[PDB]
Ligand binder design. Structure first.
Ligand SMILES: O=C(O)[C@H]1CN(c2ncnc3[nH]c4cc(F)ccc4c23)CCC12CCC2
Length: 167
């Protein structure tokens, strides 16, 4: 039993809710919140900008030190950093950005990072400003992640479309 509430169950291990991931994180304080990161951990907009803003820019300060030490992530890769006031940990995961021409096959590799964590609160990778089809992202999620994932979908219209079209 965990503290996630109001989710629709899609599969044995994937759950979904129309929610603001920032507000959801603030209330649940999950062990892991996933950020829709880029390879530079520049949290300017989308989910990343919202999560970073909610940390009063502490996520960005920590991220800049991480990059200065380690260099950029790989597309499809991840790193674990602090969850600040939102979660114990933040798993920064880089899905491919279609608006940069990145290979969508890397979306499966991106979701594989979730399997290193027993339970996660997450957005749909490569959705939103990353330009991928969220229905495709949900399919890859379900077919790749084996651990327990609670997906927060900000847009109510998209949430309804994702549920109604789910196979
Ligand atoms: O979920 C969606 O409907 C959109 C938007 N996003 C998010 N997903 C969950 N929580 C969110 N909180 C946010 C606060 C913001 F300022 C901006 C975006 C998000 C956000 C990221 C892109 C997507 C996920 C599927 C396409």
């Amino acid at each position: 039993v965990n503290s996630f509430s109001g989710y629709l169950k899609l599969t044995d291990n994937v759950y979904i809710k129309n929610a603001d991931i920032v507000e959801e994180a603030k209330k649940v304080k999950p062990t892991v919140v996933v950020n829709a990161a880029n390879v530079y951990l520049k949290h300017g907009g989308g989910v990343a900008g919202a999560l970073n803003k909610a940390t009063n820019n502490a996520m960005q300060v920590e991220s800049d030190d991480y990059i200065a030490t380690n260099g950029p992530l790989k597309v499809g890769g991840s790193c674990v950093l602090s969850g600040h006031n939102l979660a114990k940990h933040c798993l920064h995961v880089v899905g491919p950005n279609v608006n940069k021409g990145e290979d969508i096959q890397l979306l499966k590799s991106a979701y594989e990072n979730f399997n290193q964590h027993e339970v996660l609160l997450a957005p749909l990778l490569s959705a939103g400003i990353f330009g991928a089809d969220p229905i495709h992202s949900l399919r890859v999620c379900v077919d790749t992640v084996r651990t327990n994932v609670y997906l927060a979908v900000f847009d109510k219209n998209l949430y309804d479309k994702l549920v109604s079209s789910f196979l």
